[PDB]
């Protein structure tokens, strides 16, 4: 398994999925599957595309990727017409939280509640607001404790200083 | 009802395989934009399963007559405007095998031959059918395979013989 299984969609075109052997995007195997509207449906598609793996849940990727050559159902031509989309990671087996890199002087934090079951977006906001409050930057975050298809009870994240001993601490991503 | 078109694949070396879109009845190119003509039955079978993931394809057999397929594609599917080609499709047989239903038109007869000791090709059986109608001064109108014994291998054939209706001739010579 040289790549993480995941699916990417763009309504109007056939779904794409990560080729776990080489690491490139391929198009829907049957040339018939279009964008999906529910988390339950996305999870099924993941399982249909990766029959050899035990897909047990799904979660949005933290950052968009650029995919080219989207095919259209019916059309012969898959025009290299780039699109920036947020893939869905097909999580496999027993759930384990993402390992996150903690750059020096940054802090690893996490929040959870046994009685809340929210989305990836909600947890992303929590993490962002928590770092923002302390006047810092959100460098990375991951979900914790799944409670449903693409639903979690918490978030683990990394907050970073605007600068260390005078020098600004930067990074680039997601837009 | 909500009946689908029989699944099948068509090849033309130097181009991407085509497969029948079972939902609209029209041909589509290779989903991955990389698969090309195959040279083994086992390979044909594997390709069927690949483009028809939701069907239990358990065998393959050549269709009886070639078909005209427009706009083939080259690897990558960036250039697909081309000259139509006459190719003989491969039927992707699903699930449990059952003999095709043959229409016996007026004045024709339905015959079938099965040899439980042999395991021949589609071509062999087509010939056995053609020759059997010839021996009775008739013409082979249609046929289908019987008793599968391997990937695209059968133990028999069912066919329909019909009146020749052909203009013969002789020679007037000195």
From Swiss-Prot, chain A:
Zn(2+) 1 binds at residues 156, 159-160. Heparin binds at residues 69-83. Residues 104-162 are annotated as: CuBD subdomain. Changing residue 81 to A: Loss of the copper binding site in the GFLD subdomain. The record marks 143 as: Required for Cu(2+) reduction. This is N-APP. Disulfide bonds join 11-35, 46-90, 71-78, 106-160, 117-147, 131-159. It comes from Homo sapiens. Residues 1-162 form the E1 domain. Residues 1-96 are annotated as: GFLD subdomain. Changing residue 110 to N: Binds copper. Forms dimer. The chain holds residues 28 to 190 of 770 of the full protein. Cu(2+) 1 binds at residues 120, 124, 141. The lineage of its organism: Eukaryota, Metazoa, Chordata, Craniata, Vertebrata.
Curated annotation (Swiss-Prot), chain B:
The record marks 145 as: Required for Cu(2+) reduction. Changing residue 126 to A: Loss of a copper binding site. It comes from Homo sapiens (Human). Changing residue 85 to A: Loss of the copper binding site in the GFLD subdomain. Heparin binds at residues 71-85. Disulfide bonds join 13-37, 48-92, 73-80, 108-162, 119-149, 133-161. This is N-APP. Zn(2+) 1 binds at residues 158, 161-162. It comes from the Eukaryota. Residues 3-98 are annotated as: GFLD subdomain. Cu(2+) 1 binds at residues 122, 126, 143. Residues 106-164 are annotated as: CuBD subdomain.
């Amino acid at each position: 398994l040289l790549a993480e299984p995941q699916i990417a969609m763009f309504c109007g075109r056939l779904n794409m999925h990560m080729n776990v052997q080489n690491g490139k995007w391929d198009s829907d195997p049957s040339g018939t599957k279009t964008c999906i509207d529910t988390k339950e449906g996305i999870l099924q598609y993941c399982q249909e595309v990766y029959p050899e793996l035990q897909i047990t849940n799904v979660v949005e990727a933290n950052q968009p990727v650029t995919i080219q050559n989207w095919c259209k159902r019916g059309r012969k031509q898959c025009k290299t017409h780039p699109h920036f989309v947020i893939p869905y990671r097909c999580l496999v087996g027993e759930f384990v939280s993402d390992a996150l890199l903690v750059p020096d002087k940054c802090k690893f934090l996490h929040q959870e509640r046994m009685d809340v079951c929210e989305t990836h977006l909600h947890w992303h906001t929590v993490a962002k607001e928590t770092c923002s409050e302390k006047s810092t930057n959100l460098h990375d975050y991951g979900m914790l404790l799944p409670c449903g298809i693409d639903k979690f009870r918490g978030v683990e994240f990394v907050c970073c200083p605007l600068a260390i001993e005078g020098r600004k601490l930067a990074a680039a991503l997601e837009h």
